[PDB]
Amino acid sequence: MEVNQLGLIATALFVLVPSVFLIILYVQTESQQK
Amino acid sequence: MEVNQLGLIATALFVLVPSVFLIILYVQTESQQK
Amino acid sequence: QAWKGHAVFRNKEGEELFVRRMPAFFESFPVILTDKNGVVKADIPFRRAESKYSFE
Amino acid sequence: ELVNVVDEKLGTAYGEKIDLNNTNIAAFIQYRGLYPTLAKLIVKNAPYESVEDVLNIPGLTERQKQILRENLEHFTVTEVETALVEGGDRYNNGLYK
Amino acid sequence: MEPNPNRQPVELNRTSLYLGLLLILVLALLFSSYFFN
Amino acid sequence: ANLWERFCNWVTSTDNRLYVGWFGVIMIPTLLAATICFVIAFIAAPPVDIDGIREPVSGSLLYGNNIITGAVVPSSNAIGLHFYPIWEAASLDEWLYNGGPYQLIIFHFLLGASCYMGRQWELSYRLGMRPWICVAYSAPLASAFAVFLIYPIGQGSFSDGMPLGISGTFNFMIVFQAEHNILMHPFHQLGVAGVFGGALFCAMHGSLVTSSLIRETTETESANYGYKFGQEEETYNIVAAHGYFGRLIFQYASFNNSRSLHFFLAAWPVVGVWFAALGISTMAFNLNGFNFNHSVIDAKGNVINTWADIINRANLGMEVMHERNAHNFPLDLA
Amino acid sequence: METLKITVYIVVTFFVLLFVFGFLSGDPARNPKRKDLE
Amino acid sequence: METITYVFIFACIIALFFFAIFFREPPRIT
Amino acid sequence: TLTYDDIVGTGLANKCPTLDDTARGAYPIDSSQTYRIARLCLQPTTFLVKEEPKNKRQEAEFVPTKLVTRETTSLDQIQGELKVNSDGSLTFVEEDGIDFQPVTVQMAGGERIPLLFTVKNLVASTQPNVTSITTSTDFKGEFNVPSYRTANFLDPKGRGLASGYDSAIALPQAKEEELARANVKRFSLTKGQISLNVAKVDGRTGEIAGTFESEQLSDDDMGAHEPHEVKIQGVFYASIEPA
Ligand code: CLA
Ligand code: CLA
Ligand code: CLA
Ligand SMILES: CC(C)=CCC/C(C)=C/CC/C(C)=C/CC/C(C)=C/CC/C(C)=C/CC/C(C)=C/CC/C(C)=C/CC/C(C)=C/CC/C(C)=C/CC1=CC(=O)C(C)=C(C)C1=O
Ligand SMILES: CCCCCCCCCCCCCCCC(=O)OC[C@H](CO[C@@H]1O[C@H](CS(=O)(=O)O)[C@@H](O)[C@H](O)[C@H]1O)OC(=O)CCCCCCCCCCCCCCC
Ligand SMILES: CCCCCCCCCCCCCCCC(=O)OC[C@H](CO[C@@H]1O[C@H](CS(=O)(=O)O)[C@@H](O)[C@H](O)[C@H]1O)OC(=O)CCCCCCCCCCCCCCC
Ligand SMILES: CCCCCCCCCCCCCCCC(=O)OC[C@H](CO[C@@H]1O[C@H](CS(=O)(=O)O)[C@@H](O)[C@H](O)[C@H]1O)OC(=O)CCCCCCCCCCCCCCC
Ligand SMILES: CCCCCCCCCCCCCCCC(=O)OC[C@H](COP(=O)(O)OC[C@@H](O)CO)OC(=O)CCCCCCCCCCCCCCC
Ligand SMILES: CC1=C(/C=C/C(C)=C/C=C/C(C)=C/C=C/C=C(C)/C=C/C=C(C)/C=C/C2=C(C)CCCC2(C)C)C(C)(C)CCC1
Ligand SMILES: CC1=C(/C=C/C(C)=C/C=C/C(C)=C/C=C/C=C(C)/C=C/C=C(C)/C=C/C2=C(C)CCCC2(C)C)C(C)(C)CCC1
Ligand SMILES: CC1=C(/C=C/C(C)=C/C=C/C(C)=C/C=C/C=C(C)/C=C/C=C(C)/C=C/C2=C(C)CCCC2(C)C)C(C)(C)CCC1
Ligand code: OEX
Ligand SMILES: [Ca+2]
Ligand SMILES: [Cl-]
Ligand SMILES: [Cl-]
Predict the structure, then answer these.
(1) Chain I CB contacts of F73 below 8 Å
(2) Are I143 and I195 in contact (CB under 8 A)?
C-alpha cells in the first residue's frame, strides 16, 4: 500500500519519546531513599 | 538520492534506545540518597 | 522470470567463442571471448584507438 | 483504446428514439397504445434488421399493426449491445422511480 | 511477600553517562551512512 | 474436604487475585475464545462476503486495512439468522469467506459479558456488599445485545449486526439513520441526554469534590497525598461543596446528601443508556423515529420544508447509496 | 467437521455442568454473614 | 511495516495490562 | 416421494436426480416425432483452474480448488428443444431455466476465482444416426458466457458501466491514463464448451444420467483483469419427452 514513508518514524518517536521520559522519571523515583 | 528508507528509523532508534537507557540509569543514580 | 536460453557466441569465421566468467572476487569484470583453446578472439575494449578484438 | 459501450450508444439513434433491439421495455410507456401488450411482443421478437420489420410479428391484430405504423417514427434499430440485453435488463434494468 | 536479599542498587555516574552518550553518538555518526546506503 | 468441595472453595474464593466464581467458569473460556478469534481475525482474516452478493469486504490489517478501517466483518446475508459454527462449513476457507469469525466472536462475547454481569453480583455477595453494581453494567451490556443480537433478529440477518471495527461502526450508524431516522427517535434522544448528562455530571462531581479537598499537603506535593487509602474521615468538605453549588444555581437544586447525589450519578446515565439500548432494540422491529416529512403545508398545498425535511434529504442520500449492488426491488424492507 | 463438533459439545457440556452443580453446592451459604438460609 | 507497527502497539498495551494488574503498587491501609 | 420439508437444509436440493445401476436401457428416437428435454440438471463435483504459466511456457496444468460459496452450484430446471437432424444426430437447443450460478473457488495460497458457471444458450449435438439414446450417446456443444457482473454493477469506488462514476473521484487531479482500465468498465462475452457423457438410460421413462465436463473462462471483473480458464466436472440428469 502507498503509505506515508514518514509514518513509521513518526509513530515510533511518538511512542518512544514520551514513554522514555516517563520511565526515566519512574526509575529515579524508585531509586530515591525509602 | 535513493537512500534506504529504513535508514532514518534505524539511525534514530540506534541513538535513542541506548541513550535513553543511560539517561534512565544516570537520573535514578542522582536521585539516590547522598 | 525465465531462462533466456543458452547463448552461443560465434565470430565472422563461424568459430565458437566463449565468454570468460566473472570470479566471485570481482565486483566488475571485463568482457573477453576466447576460442575453445583459450586464445583471445574478441573483447569489449576500453581504449578504442588500438583495438583489434572489438565485436565490430 | 477502452470504450464505455453504453455512453457510446447514447451518441447513436439509441439516444434519440426507442431502440427495438436494445431499449428497456418501460420506454414504450412514452407513447399511446404500446405498453404492455405490444412492448412485450416487440422485445420478445427482437432483434430487427429495420424498424418496419416490427410489422411482421406473428399473431398481430389489424389494430396493433396500425398502432405500430403510427409509432415507427419513434423507433430505431441499432446493433444489439450485450451490456443492455444481458441480465434480463430489457425487462428490468434496476431503475424504478 | 518477604523481600529478596539479593537485590542491589544500580549506578551510572555522570562521567559514565557522558562516555556512554559519546560512544553511542559517534557509533551513530559512523554507522548512519551505511544504514542509509 | 473432598475434591469437589475443595474445587468449589477455590472457585468461590474471596482470596483469588481475580475472582473466578461460577459465572466466571463460563466467562473465562468464552471471553478467551472471543478475544483470541477477534485478534487473529482482525490481523489476518481474508475478505468476507457480508451482503451475500459475492462482493467480499476486506476487514483485516494484512489485507489492506489500518486500525481505523479494519474490522471483523459480519456474517453473510445468505446465512441470515442461521447458526454458522466452524463445523457447519466444508472448510476453514469457506468459513472465512462467509464471515464465520463474526458469529463465533459475538456469541462467545455476549455469553461472556452476561457472565461478567452475573460475576459482579456474585463477588458483591461474597464481600457482603449491596448487589446493584451489576444493574448499572446492564446498561452497556443491553446496548451490546441490541447491536449484535436484537437488531440482527428483527432484520433477519447477522449481516446487519454492528461490525467489529471502528469504520464498520460508523457504517452501521449511517445506515441505521437512513432506515430508522434514529436521531428523531425519543429513546435515542434520551440516550444522548444520558451520555451528555453523564459526562456533565461526571465533570461536575469531579470538579466539586476536587474544589473542596481539605488542605493536608504543601504546594510542592500533589494534593492526592492528602488522602490515604482506607482512612475513616472524608477527604473533602461536602458542606463547602454544597455551599458552593447551592449558590451557583440556588440552594434547593444542590444535593446535601452524598447517598442521594451518588444515586443520581448512577441513575442518570444508566436509565438514559437503557433507553438508548431500547431505542436500538425497538427500531429492530421497525418502530422508527418521528416522521414529519411534508408535515407543514401552505394554504394552496405547497410543501413548506422544515429542518425535518432537510434531515430527510440527507437520509435519502444514505439510503440510495448503501449496499449499492444488493437491492433489486424498489423498497428496502429489511 | 465432526471431531471438532463433538469436542466443542463435550467442552461446553463440561463447563455448563460446572456452572449448574457449582451453584447447587450450597451457594446461599457462601457469604460473610448469615449462612443458615436452608 | 504498518501492520507490524499496529500489532506492536497493541501487544505493548496487552503487556501493560499484565503489569498494571499483577505488578501494581499494592494498595495499603495506613 | 420426498417433500420440501424432507429435503430442506440437507444439501439434496443441490443434487441432480440419479438412476440406479439397472438403468442401462435404450430410449428409441422416432425421427418423425418432435422432442424436448423437460429437465436438464448439472451438478458440479469438481472445479479446476488452469494455473497461470510461470513463464517457462510449457503446459500449464488445471489444478484443484476449494469451493467457498457452499451448495449453490448446480444448474437445474433447464428445458429446450431436442431436434432430430437429417443425419440422425440429435441437437439440444437450450431455451430456459436456472442455467447459471455464480461460483467462487479458492486456489492453494488463497487466490479466489469467481466464475459464472453456466450453459446459457447451450447448443449440444450427438453423433449422427442416433436411432436410440444409449449409454454410448454423448452430447457436445457450446454455450455463451456473459460477464459475471451485469452492467449496473458498481465497484467499491462507485464506478460502473450502465451506472456509476466514470472516473476515480477520490483522486481528483490524478492523470487518467494509468487508471483507464479500472475506470472504463467492459462487458465480457465469450464461449464455453461442454461434453455430456451418458452413463445410464431408462428406456421406459426417457430419463438419462451421466457425467459432464465443461470448459469456460472465469470472471474478468468488468475488464479490470485477465480471466482464468476453468474446467468443471460433474454429473448430469435429463428427462427426454415427446412434445
Ligand atoms: C464456558 C465454556 C464455553 C461455552 C459456554 C461455549 C459456547 C459456545 N461455543 Mg465455544 N469453545 C470453548 C468454550 C465454550 N464455548 C473452548 C474452551 C473452545 C476451544 C476448544 C471453544 C471452541 C468453539 C468453536 C470452534 C466454536 C464454538 C462455538 C460455541 C457456540 C455453540 C456451542 C454448542 O453448539 O454447544 C451445544 C451444547 C449444548 C446445547 C449443551 C446441552 C447440554 C446441557 C447439559 C443441557 C442444558 C443447557 C441448556 C441449553 C440450558 C443452559 C443452562 C442454564 C439454564 C444455566 C457457543 C457460543 C461455535 C460457534 O461459536 O458458532 C458460531 C463454534 O464454531 N466454541
Ligand atoms: C447551546 C447549545 C445547546 C443546547 C442548549 C442544547 C440542548 C439540548 N440538546 Mg443539543 N447539541 C449541541 C448544542 C446544544 N444542545 C451541539 C453543539 C451538538 C453537537 C452538534 C448537540 C447534539 C445533540 C444531540 C444528538 C441531541 C441533543 C439533544 C439536546 C437536548 C438534551 C441535552 C442534554 O440532556 O444535555 C445534557 C445536559 C443536562 C442533562 C443538563 C440539563 C439541561 C437542560 C436542557 C437545561 C434545563 C434549563 C431549564 C429549561 C431552565 C429553567 C429554569 C427553572 C429552574 C425556572 C437539549 C434540548 C437531544 C435532543 O434533541 O432531545 C430532544 C439529542 O438527541 N444535542
Ligand atoms: C453528538 C452526537 C451524538 C451523540 C452524543 C450520540 C450518542 C449515542 N449514540 Mg447516536 N448517532 C448520531 C449522533 C450521536 N449519538 C448520528 C449523527 C447517527 C447517525 C449517523 C447516530 C446513530 C446511532 C446508532 C445506530 C447508535 C447510536 C448509539 C448512541 C449511544 C452510543 C454509546 C452507547 O451505545 O453506550 C452503551 C455502551 C456500549 C455499547 C458499550 C458496551 C460494552 C461491552 C458490554 C463491554 C465491551 C468490552 C470491550 C470489548 C473490552 C474493554 C477493554 C478491556 C481491556 C477490558 C449514545 C447514546 C448506539 C446506541 O444507542 O446503542 C444502544 C447505537 O446503536 N447512535
Ligand atoms: C444589564 C442588566 C439589566 C443587569 C441586571 C442584572 C441583575 C442585577 C439581575 C438581578 C435580577 C435577576 C436575578 C434576574 C434574573 C434573570 C433571569 C431569569 C435570567 C435567566 C438565566 C437562565 C437562562 C437560567 C437558566 C437556569 C439554569 C442555570 C438551569 C441549569 C441548572 C439546573 C437545571 C440544575 C439542576 C441539574 C442537577 C440535578 C444537578 C445536580 C447534579 C450535580 C451537579 C451533581 C454534582 C454534585 C452536586 C452537589 O450538590 C454536591 C454537593 C457535590 C459534591 C457534587 O458532586
Ligand atoms: C492461542 C490459543 C492458546 C491459549 C492458551 C491459554 C491458556 C492459558 C493457561 C495457562 C495458565 C497459567 C495462567 C496463570 C496466570 C494467573 O492468572 O495467575 C494469577 C492468580 C494466581 O493464581 C493462584 O495460584 C496460587 C498458587 S501460585 O501462586 O501460582 O503458586 C493459588 O494459591 C491460587 O489458588 C490461585 O488462584 O490467578 C487467579 O487470580 C485466579 C485465576 C484467574 C484467571 C482468569 C483469567 C481471566 C481472563 C479473562 C478473559 C479476557 C482476556 C482478554 C485479554 C484482555
Ligand atoms: C403529572 C404526571 C402524573 C404523575 C405520574 C407519576 C410518574 C412516575 C414518576 C416517577 C417517580 C420517581 C420517584 C423517584 C424517587 C427516588 O429516586 O428516591 C431516591 C432518592 C431519594 O431522595 C432523597 O430522599 C431522602 C429521604 S427518603 O429516602 O425519601 O426517605 C433524603 O434523605 C434525600 O436528601 C433526598 O434527596 O432520590 C434521589 O436520590 C434524588 C433524585 C434523583 C432523581 C431520580 C430519578 C432517576 C434519574 C432520572 C432518570 C433519567 C431520565 C433522563 C434520561 C437521561
Ligand atoms: C516503548 C515502551 C512501551 C512498552 C511497554 C510495555 C510494558 C509496560 C510495562 C513496563 C513497566 C514495568 C513496571 C515495573 C513493575 C515492577 O514492579 O518491577 C518489579 C517486578 C516485581 O514486582 C515488584 O517487586 C519488587 C521487588 S523484586 O523485584 O521482586 O525484588 C518490589 O519493589 C515491588 O513491591 C513489587 O511490585 O519484577 C521485575 O523486576 C520486572 C520488571 C521488568 C519489566 C520490564 C520488562 C518489559 C519487557 C517485556 C516484554 C515481553 C516480551 C515477550 C516475551 C514473551
Ligand atoms: C535489542 C535491544 C537492545 C537494547 C540494549 C541497550 C544497549 C545499551 C548500550 C550501553 C552502552 C553504554 C556504554 C557505557 C559507557 C560507560 O559507562 O563507560 C564508563 C564505565 C565506567 O565504569 P566504572 O566501573 O567506573 O563504574 C561506573 C558506574 O557508574 C557505571 O555504571 O566503563 C564501562 O562501561 C566500560 C566500557 C567503556 C566504553 C568506553 C568507550 C567510550 C570512549 C569514546 C568512544 C567514542 C569516540 C571515538 C572517537 C574515535
Ligand atoms: C521525525 C519526524 C519529524 C521531525 C521532527 C523534528 C525535526 C523535531 C524536532 C525537534 C526538536 C529539535 C526539539 C527540541 C527541543 C528541545 C528542548 C526541549 C530543549 C531543552 C532544553 C533545556 C532543558 C535546557 C537546559 C538548560 C541548559 C542546557 C543549560 C543551563 C540552563 C538550562 C537548565 C535551562 C516530522 C514532524 C517533520 C515528520 C514526521 C517524523
Ligand atoms: C526498526 C528497524 C528494524 C527492527 C527492529 C526490531 C523489529 C526489533 C526488535 C526487537 C525486540 C522486539 C526486542 C526485544 C526485547 C526484549 C527484552 C529485552 C526483554 C526483556 C525482558 C525482561 C527484562 C523481563 C523481565 C521480567 C518480567 C517481565 C517478569 C518477571 C521476571 C523478569 C524480571 C525476568 C530493522 C532491524 C528490521 C531494520 C531497521 C529499523
Ligand atoms: C479449566 C477451568 C478454567 C479455565 C479455563 C480456561 C483457561 C480456558 C480456556 C480457553 C481458551 C483459551 C479458548 C480458546 C479458544 C479459541 C478459539 C476458539 C479460537 C479460534 C479461532 C479461530 C478458529 C481462528 C481462525 C482463523 C482466522 C479467524 C483468521 C486467519 C485464519 C484462521 C483459520 C487461523 C477456569 C479458571 C474457568 C475454572 C474452571 C475450570
Ligand atoms: O443488509 Mn445491511 O442494510 Ca438492513 O436495509 Mn435492506 O438489509 Mn441491507 O439494505 Mn438497507
Ligand atoms: Ca457413456
Ligand atoms: Cl453500506
Ligand atoms: Cl432486493
Answers:
(1) none
(2) no
